[PDB]
Each structure stands twice: as C-alpha cells, then as structure tokens.
Amino acid sequence: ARWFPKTLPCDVTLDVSKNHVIVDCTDKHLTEIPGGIPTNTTNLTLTINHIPDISPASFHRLVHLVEIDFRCNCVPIRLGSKSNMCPRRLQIKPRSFSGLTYLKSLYLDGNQLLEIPQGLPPSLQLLSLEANNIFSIRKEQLTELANIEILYLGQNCYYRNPCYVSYSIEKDAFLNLTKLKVLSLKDNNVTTVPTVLPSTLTELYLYNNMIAEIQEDDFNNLNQLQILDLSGNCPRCYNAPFPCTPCKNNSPLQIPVNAFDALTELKVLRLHSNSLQHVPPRWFKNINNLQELDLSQNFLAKEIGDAKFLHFLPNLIQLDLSFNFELQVYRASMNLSQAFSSLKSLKILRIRGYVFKELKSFQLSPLHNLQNLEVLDLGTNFIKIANLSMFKQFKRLKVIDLSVNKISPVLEQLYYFRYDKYARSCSCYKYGQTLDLSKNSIFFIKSSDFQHLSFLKCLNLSGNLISQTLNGSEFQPLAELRYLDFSNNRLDLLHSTAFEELRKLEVLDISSNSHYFQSEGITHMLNFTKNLKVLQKLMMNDNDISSSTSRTMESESLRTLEFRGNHLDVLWRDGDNRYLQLFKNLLKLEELDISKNSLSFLPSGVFDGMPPNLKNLSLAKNGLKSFIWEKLRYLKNLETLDLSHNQLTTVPERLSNCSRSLKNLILKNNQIRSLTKYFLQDAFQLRYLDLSSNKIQMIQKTSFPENVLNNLKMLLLHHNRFLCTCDAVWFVWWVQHTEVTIPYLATDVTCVGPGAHKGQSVISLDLYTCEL
Amino acid sequence: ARWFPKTLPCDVTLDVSKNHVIVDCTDKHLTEIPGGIPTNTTNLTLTINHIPDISPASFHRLVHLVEIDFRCNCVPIRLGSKSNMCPRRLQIKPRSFSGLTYLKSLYLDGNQLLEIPQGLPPSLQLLSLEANNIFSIRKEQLTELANIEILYLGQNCYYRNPCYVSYSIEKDAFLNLTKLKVLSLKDNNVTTVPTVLPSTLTELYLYNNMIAEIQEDDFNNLNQLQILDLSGNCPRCYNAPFPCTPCKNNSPLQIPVNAFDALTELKVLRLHSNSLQHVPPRWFKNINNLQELDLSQNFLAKEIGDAKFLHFLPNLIQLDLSFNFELQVYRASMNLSQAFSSLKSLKILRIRGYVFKELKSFQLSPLHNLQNLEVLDLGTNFIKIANLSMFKQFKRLKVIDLSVNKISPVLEQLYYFRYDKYARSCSCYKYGQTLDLSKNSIFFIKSSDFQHLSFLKCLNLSGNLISQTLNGSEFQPLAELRYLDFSNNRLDLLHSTAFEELRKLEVLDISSNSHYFQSEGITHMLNFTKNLKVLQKLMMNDNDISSSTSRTMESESLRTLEFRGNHLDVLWRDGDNRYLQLFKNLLKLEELDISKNSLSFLPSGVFDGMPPNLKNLSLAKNGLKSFIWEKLRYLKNLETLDLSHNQLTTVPERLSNCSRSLKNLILKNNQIRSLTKYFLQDAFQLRYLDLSSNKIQMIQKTSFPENVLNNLKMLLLHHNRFLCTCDAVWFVWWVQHTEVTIPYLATDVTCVGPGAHKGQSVISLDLYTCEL
Numbered sequence A, B: 001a002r003w004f005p006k007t008l009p010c011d012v013t014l015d016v017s018k019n020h021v022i023v024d025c026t027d028k029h030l031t032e033i034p035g036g037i038p039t040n041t042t043n044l045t046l047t048i049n050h051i052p053d054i055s056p057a058s059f060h061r062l063v064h065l066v067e068i069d070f071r072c073n074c075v076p077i078r079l080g081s082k083s084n085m086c087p088r089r090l091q092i093k094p095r096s097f098s099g100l101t102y103l104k105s106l107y108l109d110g111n112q113l114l115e116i117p118q119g120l121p122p123s124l125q126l127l128s129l130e131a132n133n134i135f136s137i138r139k140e141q142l143t144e145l146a147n148i149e150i151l152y153l154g155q156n157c158y159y160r161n162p163c164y165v166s167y168s169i170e171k172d173a174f175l176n177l178t179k180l181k182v183l184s185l186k187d188n189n190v191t192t193v194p195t196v197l198p199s200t201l202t203e204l205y206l207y208n209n210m211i212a213e214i215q216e217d218d219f220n221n222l223n224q225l226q227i228l229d230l231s232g233n234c235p236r237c238y239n240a241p242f243p244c245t246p247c248k249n250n251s252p253l254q255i256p257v258n259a260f261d262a263l264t265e266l267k268v269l270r271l272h273s274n275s276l277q278h279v280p281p282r283w284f285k286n287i288n289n290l291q292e293l294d295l296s297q298n299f300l301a302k303e304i305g306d307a308k309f310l311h312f313l314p315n316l317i318q319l320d321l322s323f324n325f326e327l328q329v330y331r332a333s334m335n336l337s338q339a340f341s342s343l344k345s346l347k348i349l350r351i352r353g354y355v356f357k358e359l360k361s362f363q364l365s366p367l368h369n370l371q372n373l374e375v376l377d378l379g380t381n382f383i384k385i386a387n388l389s390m391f392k393q394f395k396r397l398k399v400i401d402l403s404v405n406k407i408s409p410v411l412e413q414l415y416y417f418r419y420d421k422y423a424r425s426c427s428c429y430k431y432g433q434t435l436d437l438s439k440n441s442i443f444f445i446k447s448s449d450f451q452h453l454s455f456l457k458c459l460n461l462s463g464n465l466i467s468q469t470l471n472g473s474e475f476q477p478l479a480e481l482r483y484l485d486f487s488n489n490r491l492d493l494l495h496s497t498a499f500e501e502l503r504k505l506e507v508l509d510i511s512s513n514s515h516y517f518q519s520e521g522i523t524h525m526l527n528f529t530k531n532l533k534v535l536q537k538l539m540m541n542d543n544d545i546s547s548s549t550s551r552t553m554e555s556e557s558l559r560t561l562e563f564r565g566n567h568l569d570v571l572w573r574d575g576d577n578r579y580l581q582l583f584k585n586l587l588k589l590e591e592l593d594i595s596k597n598s599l600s601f602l603p604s605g606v607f608d609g610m611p612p613n614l615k616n617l618s619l620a621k622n623g624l625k626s627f628i629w630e631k632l633r634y635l636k637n638l639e640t641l642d643l644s645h646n647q648l649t650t651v652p653e654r655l656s657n658c659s660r661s662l663k664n665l666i667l668k669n670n671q672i673r674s675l676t677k678y679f680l681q682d683a684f685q686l687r688y689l690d691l692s693s694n695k696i697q698m699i700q701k702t703s704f705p706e707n708v709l710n711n712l713k714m715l716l717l718h719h720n721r722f723l724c725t726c727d728a729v730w731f732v733w734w735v736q737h738t739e740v741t742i743p744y745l746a747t748d749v750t751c752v753g754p755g756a757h758k759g760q761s762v763i764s765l766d767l768y769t770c771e772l
Ligand SMILES: *[C@@H]1O[C@H](CO)[C@@H](O[C@@H]2O[C@H](CO)[C@@H](O[C@@H]3O[C@H](CO)[C@@H](O)[C@H](O)[C@@H]3O)[C@H](O)[C@H]2NC(C)=O)[C@H](O)[C@H]1NC(C)=O
Pocket: A157, A158, A159, A161, A162, A163, A164, A165, A166, A167, A189
C-alpha cells in the first residue's frame, strides 16, 4: 500500500491548497535535526527537543521554508524540566537563516539566547524571542527587521527568568521598523515606555514591568493603536500568588490626564493591577471607540460609587472592576454610581471582589435600562443575603454569576490572580439564561426562593449545602428550567418525587452527592427518574451508591446516564439477582458510563439486563480480571466499548462471533500478552482498535487479517513488549508499509528484544537477515 | 551465615515455647503440596491455593501435625475468584487423615465438599466445613467425631452458595457427640432447631435460616449454654442489602414464653432480624446472668416505650434496640420506658434507627442513674433538634454517638445491615469523653451551643456544613478539649484566631476542608497554629492548598503535621522564594507528610527550610522525576525518608555521604534500573531499605557491603527485573545464604531472564554451570 516506509520521526501533512508541507517534530526527544526532511517543506516545527545548535547545514536544502518553530530547545532553568535541564544555551552560527529567502515566521522562544539573532532574511514578518536572556535592545541589532510586523520580546527578565538589571532600550530603537504592528515587552523589568515608537503599531504590550510613570507624550504618535496594556506596573500585591513588588509610597502608575489623547483608534485598554485610586474622566476625552476596559485589581472601591469617567464610554462593551475592595473592610452594600446607566452598549460587567454583605434590588438600578447587558458577574463577594427575585428585572441577560459567595436563607480557574494569564508555554450557558449560584452556603431551598424567575433555563446550585428530602415542591416556579447542576450537595432521595416539578428538565447533574448514599439502611429511591418526561442526560457520578430501595430506574426519555464512581460491585454482589435490571427500563438509553465501580467481574445477567439501544458503554477503571466476551451478543446496538485501565489478559477467539455491531474497541492499559489466533477475523464493522499499553509480544497475520485492518480509521499499538525476531517479520513489514494511522511510531512503538534490537523503533527495523 | 538455603515456598517459624513448628503456605499459587515440609511440623496452613486433591501421600511423613488449615482450595463459584474459578471439587482419598494421630484442628472450609470427610482421627477437637455443599447431616456420618468440641457447618446452603432444598438433620444426630461445645449451622436454610442436642453445648448458632417456630422443649437440656443466636429467622427485610424472604403475614419467629427456661447459664442472646413486635418478660424469668442482648432489626418501636422485660435483666451489660422504626413514620420524639432505669449494670445502649425529630433532656431521664453507662448510641435517627447541653448529665460516659443525624441550630461501615457480620473469609475515644456529632447538618456554631460541656475531651464535627470564619469565639466552653475532628467541613481561615479558645487542644484535624482553598484570591491564615500552645498533631490533608496569605506556620509545641494532598508545587513554583520556610518555625516538628503534593521536583531551599528536628519525612506519590540526594545533609535528624511511588531512576553514589542519621529508606514503586557502585558503603545507621517494585537487573557486592546488610532489620527487593546470567552469581548466592529478612523470596523475587530461567525464583537457581 506504501512502497517507501515513512521513517522520519515527525508527522508530515499536505495542505495542497496553500502549497503547505507541514513537518511537525514537536517533542521527539531529538538531539539533531533529522535527515531527510522534505525539500518542499514550508512549516517546520522542532519545539521541545534537545537540539543544541543551528548552522547553515540545519536548513540547507529547505529553501521553501516560510515558518520555523524552534521553541524551547533550551528553556530557562526555572521554567523547564528539572529531570532534563538544558546544559548550555542554543548556539546559532552565522548565515543560518540568511538563505531562507521566503521565511515569514521564526519562533526562537525559550532557548536562553543572549542576543537578537542577526542575518535574518528581509521577508520576516513575525519574530518571537520570548523567554530568552535578551535584556538590552539596541537600534543597530534591529535594522535587519525592516519588514517586521510582529515582535515578541517578553519574559526575558522577570522572576521565573531573572536578568538582575533594568531592561534597556535605545532611544528610537523601533522607530525605523515602519511596518511594525505588534510589540510585546511584557514581563521584562522595563522602567519607561520606550520612545519613539513607529505610528504603525496596532497593539502594544508593556504589562508586568517597573514603569512608575507615563510621560504625557509617551503615546503621541500611536494614532493606529487598538490595544494597549499597562497592567501590573505598580501592582496591587495583596494575596499575590507571584512575588510582587509595589511602587514605593503606595504610589500608582502615574498617567497624565492627556496621555491617551492621540489614541483615537484604541479599542482595548488594560489597567489591571496599577494600584489606581481614581479614574480621571479626562483620560477618555478623545477615545469614543473604546470597547474593552480592564480596571481590575486597583483600589477603586470608593470610585465605583462615583465613576464620572463612565459618561465618556458610550461604546464600551466590557467593563471589569473586579478585586477593588479595601483591605480590612466588609462593606454592608454595593454602592454603584448612577453613571453606570450611561453605558448604552455594555454587554459584560464584572465586579468580583468588591466584598459586601447584602445585595438589594435597588443597588443594581443603574443597570436597569442597559438594553444590551448580557453578563453580570458579582462572584467572590462574600454576599450573605440576596433576594434572588431581584433578577426578574434581568430576563434579558445570558448569565447572572453569583458564584463563590456566602448566600443562604467561561474564564481560566486562576484568572484574576495569575501572573501572565496570556503566557505561552512550551457548561450550561448554551441552554439560555443562567443563574450561577455555585459555591454558596444555601442549606435549605423552597419554591418562593425562585419566585419570579420562571424565565431561567439553567440553574447552578453546585457546591451548596443542600441536605434536604426534596419532595417535588422546591423548584415550582422554574417551569422553563432545562439544566440543573445539583453536584456537590447532599441529596436525600427519600422521596421518588424529587425534581419532578422541573417539567422541562433535559439535564440533571446529581454527581458528588455521596453523603446520604454513604450510610447503611437509609432509603434511596433511584426510580425518581420516571416523572421527568423530557430528561436526556443524568449524571450521578461519585455518589458511592451501593444500595437502592428501587430495583429499576425508569425513563422513556433518558439517552445518557453517567454512573461513574459508585459500587455496582455491591449491588451486583454475586448471588443477588435483584439489581441486574437496574438500567433495563431506560428504553432510549444510548450511553452508559459504569467505569470506576470496582467491578472486578461482571455477574451473568448484567449484559442481558442492559437497555436494548445501548451504543456507548464504559467499563473502564474497574479492575476487571475476566470478561465473557460472548455475552456482548445481547448488546445488539453496541458501537463503542471502553475496557481501558483494567486487568484483562486475553481477547476473544473471534470478535465477529461476539458482536455484529461493535465499531470502537478500547483495550488500552490492560495485561494482554498475546492475541487469539483469529481474533479480528471477519470483523468488518470494526473502525477503531486501541491495544496500547498492554504486554503484547507477537502479532501474527491470522489475528490481524488485512481485510479488517485496512478499514480501521485508527489502530493503537504503542507501549507493548514487541519481540523483533524473525517470527515477527509480517508485523514489522505491515507496520512499516500500512496506510492505517498508528500514533507514536516515532516515540513509543518499539522492540524490547532480542538483545540486538532492544530500544529500537519497529518502523526502522531492518530484518533482511531473515531472508538470506 | 546459612549453610543450607530455604527453598520451600512457605514461611516457617519455631515457637519453641509451645513445641510449635508453623508452616504457612497461605496463598502461594500452589497446585501440589510442596516437597520438603519439616517432619516436626505441627501447624500446616495451605489456605487459598489450587491443590485439587488430598491423599495419604499428602501428610505421610508429618505425624506430629496438630492443625491442618486447608481452607478455600476450591471455594464455591459465587464466593471465589471469577478469573480463577475452581474447576472441580477437592478430592479426599481414603485414609488421608487417619494417620495423623495428634490432629486436633481441621479446617476444610470452601472446597465444595459434598459430604462430611470420613476416616478422621479420634483426637479431633475442631472441624470446620463452612462453605461446602453438605446439606444433609446423618447420625452415621458423625460417629467418627466422638471427641469433637467445635463444629462449624454453616454457609453450606444460602444465597451465595445455594443447595436448592431444605437443610436436613436426622433426629438426635448430634446427641452422642458428648463433648460438643460449639455448633454453628448459620446460613444453612435450616427449618427447625435440630433435636436432641448434647447438654454439653456452650454456644449454639442458628442464625440466617428458615426457622419459623421454636418448640418449647427445643433447648430443654442445654443447661451449659452461654451463647444462643436465632437472628435472621423471620427477618425484617426492609432495605436489606441481601436477598430477603420474610415469614408470611409478616409473622415473627415464634418463641414460647418458656423456651429459655433451661438456659440458666446464658450470657448472650441474639434476636436480630426476627420481626419481633413484643418481648415477653416471661422469656427472662430463669436467666439472671444475661449480659448481652441484641434485639436490633425487629418491629419494637412501641415496645421500647414499655419494655417490662427490662426489669428482669439487672446484670445486662449491652443492649441493642437499633433499627426498630415503623415503616413510613417519623416520630416526634423518643419514648423510652422508665424500665430502662432498672438496668443497674448497663454499660452500652444502642438505639440507632428509631427515627425521630427532636431529642429533649427529659426523654433520656431513665438513663440518669445508670452508674456504669459508658456508651449511648443514638446514631442514624434523623434527629433535627438536640440541646447538646443535656449531656451535662452524662459526664460519666466515654462516648455519646449522634453520628449520622440531621442536627443543626468502632463498628464496620455496613454493621447492622450486612448478611453475616461474623462471616470468615479466605479514633479519639482514648482521650476521654467523646461527643460524636459527625455527618450532621450543623452549618453554624457558637459558644452557647456547648454550654455545660466543659468536661469533653474529644468532639467529632466531621462531615458537617460548617462554612464560617472561626474567630476564636465558637468553642469557648470546651476548656478541656484535647481532640477536635473538623474534617469534611468548609473551614474559612480569614482569621488567625481560629481555634485559639481550645487552649488544651493536642490534636486538630482540618483535613478535607478544601472548599475555601479551591477559590482564587481569598485570604487564608495558615499561621493560626501559633496560639495553640499544647498542639502535638495537625492534619490538613486534601485541602488542595495552593495559596497562603502567611509565609510561615509557627508552633512551639507541634510534633506532627500531615499536609498530604495539597499543592506545594504551586506554593514552591520555581522562582517563588516566599514559601520555602513555610514549615521552618515549627521548632519541635518531628514528622512531616508532604506526599501527594504534585512535587515532580523539589526547588532548592526546601530542605534548608525544614525545621531542625525533622525525623520522618514523606515525599511519596509526588511524581518526583529527580532528587538531589546531597541536600539530605541539611536534615540533620532525619531517620525515615519515604520516596515511595515516584519516578526516580537513580540512587545516590554514596548514601553515607548524604545523611549520617538516615535509618529507614523507602524507594518502592520507582523506576530504578541499577544501584550505584558503592551505594550502601559505610551507611552504618541504615536499618530498613525497600527497593521493591523497581526495574533493577543486577546488584553487585560493592553496592551491598555485608557490614551494612547484617544490621538491616529488613531489606525489600521483590518485583524487580533480575537477570540470572552468570554475572549475577554473587547476588544469587548472597540471596540464598543470607540471614537478612527479605519478604517474598518464594512469591516475587524472580528472574525475568535469560530465556532458560524466565519465571524462576532466584532462591532456587542452580548456577554451577558458571563454575566448571
Ligand atoms: C529588575 O531590575 C532591578 C534593578 O534595576 C534588579 O534589581 C537589582 O538586583 C541586584 C541583584 O538582585 C541588586 O544588586 C545587589 O546589591 C547588593 C548591595 O546592597 C549586593 O550585596 C548584591 O550581591 C547585589 O550586587 C540591585 O541592588 C538591585 N537593584 C534594585 C534597585 O533593587 C532586579 O533584579 C531586576 N529583576 C529581575 C527579575 O531580573
């Protein structure tokens, strides 16, 4: 099927449309650029390898290169592996790039470079040197970069990669770079805005530096600028989870009132962590087009009650005023200026970390006529009291977020508090209007709590204290609710009428409600499913369920059930027939996850008792030691079977004789030592087979007939114990010459023996000695 | 040191005191009795093996045998392994035991025997045949057993091991067994008390059977009987987690009022799950000696309010009235008869599962003058209200257990609800008075809640909802408290004055309080430790701690700190110096557990920052990929180092050069392929080394000097990848001939190669071919 075996340890791809030949050698444990890279190669990635030098030899033949990604072949000591520390900085010999006449992008981040590589081609539009040790920019070193448009110089002098001096930039160093659009000098220990900058800039990044003061003419020429970020100059250092040095005298970043006058094109201004106490209106006099403004992590509590600057921002889309609270203060209420009412275009308003006791309807009144408001985020406020019915005046919003509060009767997990949330390394919103009440102190709920909230489509109660015997009378107003997250509560299923009032509920998550399921001889009515007539998906993961008062769960509607991390091993105790039909009457059930249920065996009757339309079944992570494959005959619509992370030692004698329907078979991380003689014979329906991370030594043609193999979308064999004797000749040949996709042929499909070939990739194996 | 190597795959022991020669071959995957068992052998255990027959060959030479334990060499289908099902019942050929003239004990449980083995010696005092398929007892088959004293016949016909008929016992079958003390017929599908039974019985077990009626003369002769168990005849089957058939018409076990009249010696009567509605006083008329009475899992709610029978039990020590609640009733209060006051000797009273709303002081007044009462257990009652101050009238008690209740302002997990709680397979109490409030609905605490409980030594608040910013004012009355379990709450460490009122606190568990540590940019004062002047032990496991407002924890008292399952990897982010002395000022700290903290490496500064008296350090389960062993020089009092379950690939060149103090080194479950040339040279302090579950191939003499080996209490090498070539000659000899204790030389110290010796124990290896 292939005349010449692909032997290069890099994935290769044609996007013939854009004459792109893409060679990806990301993380292949290489110490040399591999031989025999295609001449027509356009994009070459050599990221995360241990290649110690670049020379004219490196790219000699590859003249059609438009991109070289050579990131992290020597990452700074503190950012990189400590088990494989890079010994010495990447060596770049002269004339290494001057050849590459079509080169448009060059990434040399995280290689401990001391200086900007010279002799670069004039075609270059983008050059990235983040996380090197370049902390002085001279005009002379930048002349090569005439046609440059995007320049990343950040992370060259900061706490993870220290240089122990101030960043230095020569006067007018970037001025003659007349096509420069994006300049990033973030995380560099910079002390003044470099001037003069080319007027051609669209984006300027100066955050996480030691800039104390903005000169009034620092941004005078930048009349094309759209994004400016001055964040984390004079940072607010309270509970900073990085080392943090504030400007002395508790001073803020000092910004002349007329500093932004030139920036008529500005769309995004970021002044996060600048220790601001006031926001002068005068800043925003000649910027009417500002859309995104970040004023998070300042000291603007008082200002939020005033905020005259808001009158000048009628086009603003996003406003962030999060974490402005005064240290040592627990305000009684949120004091929002009337000025908020002048934010005609506002779609998103975030004010986390204001920190106040009580939210009352009136206090949100400035927001009442903001027609386009879509998100209100009042998370992490330690609010103790909130009549949720106030949100009746907010039907128009997509999300009301009261997450992480103390109420009782998306973003990255570390978003506001991480150092560089945009650092490069080496959900129920879609159902409609969402009230996120997660991680609060709600211990008791009743119908009136939700009075006037009929419009809600998703309600997130995850992470509360609800410890109550729901009888179908608690959620009565929520006649439109489609999704309920009840995870991390203490559901008590005394009554099978639980949740039945939610007449349109499509998704119910009662995962991690193990409290009442963890105790012996308490009633649990798992048959509560019957009343929920439109329920598509039920999650009851990690409930530690080992007893049930009802013998059968029933739904005419339910399609997916996650039952992971329970104790079906106890319910199906060998000899106890009573629960072998627990899922049988879930008639439309298509997907069942019963992984992590300690099922070391399956009692007979388990497969017979499965509902008749089951398609996707997980029995992963069960410590299964044995498995009657023949019983798969009962599962007449089975498509996907996940037996990953078990202790199976064998496969069936004939898989076609086990199931006619089975497409996707996952057997990874088992103890399988050898295949049956005619394993896959006549199994024409099979499309995906994972046998990775087993202990297979031989694979003969009888077990792996070609007329089954050649229909496989994918076939995983890596991390086995392959013996490369002459007996293995068919398999070695077949691997080397097959079209079928087999991940990790470079990295992890390898001979353990005999002696001679130990550690050697089978892709590379010369077995001519078997043919003399 | 040893002239003749022990090759036998069984532990062997001399207890010279009791002329015992003890050969334990428990679970050695044997298919034959091994050769070369000592002639002087007295106790031979061959439990859990696959030995398919016994014959006169079996025990030929072993005439001094007093005990043969041969349990579970063929366990019934539903009780045993499904990966290694026993094919065929154990075969006992004639005259197999008749030789063994001193044989006093024979255990043949779980071997699928069809009949009572004949030709047994007349010395036999104990015979166990549990979990075979013997369900008809005939007088003739029992004549061999004249001198028998203890006879276990249970579990031969029940749901896990069915026989599909009634158990049958011939009239007077056991009568001529004139020395019989203990007869167990539990779990046998018995239909009537077998009569007549020898008067010589001390203990009779008939529980879990189909006995519907006791005839009034069924126990007439048994005037030496001490224990009687009739439990689970006519069971209460509500929430039963085994298959359960009740007597028709919900009838009870019917017991003539005079059924116990002969039993003047009875000490323990067990009537668990007999569906009793009334407890006739007349039962206890001629039993003044009764000490333990189990009336759990009946229908005795009403009776508890009356209970005239109690007046006849002034010697009773233990009373169990648990799980007597009426189905579908939630009583308002617990109605305890005054009669309880006549239980002069009572030490333990359990009434779980009465199921009531409100507990008031007066309701316990019958118990007020029970001088010897030590334990009151009112767990699993769904109590919503209890003025804890009522327990001021109970300072004499050791434990007050309100575990698993719904209060707000040891025993097996499956104790009352498992089938046979005495089925054979193949804590802060010691501090003083304990109030267990675990798994309740307490969301808020304040001082007055504990008014008049100054006498408490331990308080268990584990598993509540406490979600509050403890400021030192919540526990003020608990002046004597020594132990607090605050695990599985939601501790908010806003204030470093948390817990400071508990001035005599020696142990504080704040484990699994991860809630407020899981959210970003919240204050956490870990330095709260400073105020607790006598605190010996702090547990703050699984708190998912990745940030702290304080840079140092401090204590002059603290000796043990468990910090397992947190994120020190984030606090010690490479480049962040601020938390490297987090434990330094815990001056008396001797033990630190920082396992499960995702520490793939240890930043420099960590060992320098450890407190000066650290003795016992765990870094287990961290995914450590590297380790600077030299840094152990900073830990000048280190005795135990646990590096188990990591990814270390190398040991130090010389361990003596790394620490002078180190006694116990645990390296198990790592990736170590070889030892350094002089690894253990001059390591005179070393006493315990575990190198098990690594990938070691060779061990040369240089690495393992004899003057270090011969001080080792224990040395673990099992589950490595030992190569048994001629190069391995020293190691093989040394293993075979050393005194040093090396567990699993039989089971798991094994050659992987070469070809010839694959799978072979190194203990057994003959390498004379390397000496010709
Ligand atoms: C960012 O730039 C600043 C300064 O522009 C760097 O701070 C400087 O760092 C060095 C070494 O940390 C300090 O020098 C020291 O002086 C003392 C004498 O008191 C001497 O004992 C030391 O051995 C060393 O020579 C220098 O004073 C300090 N300057 C200031 C104003 O703090 C900083 O390290 C740079 N940041 C990064 C992350 O590279």
